[PDB]
């Protein structure tokens, strides 16, 4: 199947409290492999996976150098954005970026992406063609005009279609046991009386990878999607994920409920019972 490499950058100004902080994290699929934090005791690219730990000091020094250069640059961008929106000098602001690439069963590029947000809102995005922009507002149209003049999309497209994919391929080789295997969820069903006529059934999925999963309660074979409490999928801290789904049922009807679990690591979807 297919894989992705994605970088997530956050820069946060804090006028009067030093210069803006810059924090980056990188992932292959759902696995973090790197982080950089400008406020770290020693600000350096940090390995987060065994399969980049064996990259030697040159690789790490070069990553570190590029992160510092990016951080400074993002500080200029925050300055520029403050100006575009006529915002005061004193307020704190956030710039986010996500970019990356996906490759398919043959190791070839599928797609690339690069999006920016300012203060938690869509700002400007590279379109799917990697040649054109979508600006969310008037200020972002300035950045669009600027990047069109500068042919910024050409630089970004060259990296996303080329070097991004080369890195992703290399990481997939080095971390194959980790990266190219799914881990099925470990499931169980619990039950809690709620009142003299209702009870909760909770369907658990633990230990699964990748994060994508569907948990659905059914009654008599039919979806009760509208009546379920579903928690957000959450990291277990060991590189795997967890989720649960709960439904409140008439006491005595439990035997008619089944939980349906769909996950890549399952050869067939599971049907579970209390």
């Amino acid at each position: 199947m297919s894989h992705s490499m994605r970088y997530f950058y956050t820069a946060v100004s804090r006028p009067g409290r030093g210069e803006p902080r810059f924090i980056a994290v990188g992932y292959v699929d759902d696995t973090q492999f790197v982080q950089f934090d400008s406020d770290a005791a020693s600000p350096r690219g940090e390995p987060r996976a065994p399969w980049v730990e064996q990259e030697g000091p040159e690789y790490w020094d070069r990553e570190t150098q590029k992160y510092k250069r990016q951080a400074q640059t993002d500080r200029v961008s925050l300055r520029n954005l403050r100006g575009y929106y006529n915002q005061s000098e004193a307020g704190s602001h956030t710039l986010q970026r996500m970019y990356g690439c996906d490759l398919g069963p043959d190791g070839r590029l599928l797609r690339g992406y690069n999006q920016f947000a300012y203060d938690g809102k869509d700002y400007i995005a590279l379109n799917e063609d990697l040649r054109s922009w979508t600006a969310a507002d008037t200020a972002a149209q300035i950045t669009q005009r600027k990047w069109e003049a500068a042919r910024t999309a050409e630089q970004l497209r060259a990296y996303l279609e080329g070097t991004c994919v080369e890195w992703l391929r290399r990481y997939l080789e080095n971390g194959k046991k980790t990266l190219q295997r799914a881990e099925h969820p470990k499931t169980h069903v619990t039950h809690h009386p709620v009142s003299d006529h209702e009870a909760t059934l909770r369907c658990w999925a633990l230990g699964f990878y990748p994060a994508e999963i569907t948990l659905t309660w059914q009654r008599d074979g039919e979806d009760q999607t509208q009546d379920t409490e579903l928690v957000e999928t959450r990291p277990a801290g060991d590189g795997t994920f967890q989720k649960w789904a709960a439904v409140v049922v008439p006491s005595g009807e439990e035997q008619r409920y089944t939980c349906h679990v769909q996950h890549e690591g399952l050869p067939e979807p599971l049907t579970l019972r209390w």
Binding site: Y7, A24, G26, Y59, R62, E63, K66, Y67, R69, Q70, T73, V76, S77, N80, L81, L95, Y99, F116, Y123, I124, T143, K146, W147, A150, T152, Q155, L156, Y159, T163, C164, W167
Partner: peptide, 9 residues
Amino acid sequence: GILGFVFTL
């Protein structure tokens, strides 16, 4: 490996 080309908004 991160993008080495930088640019400002």
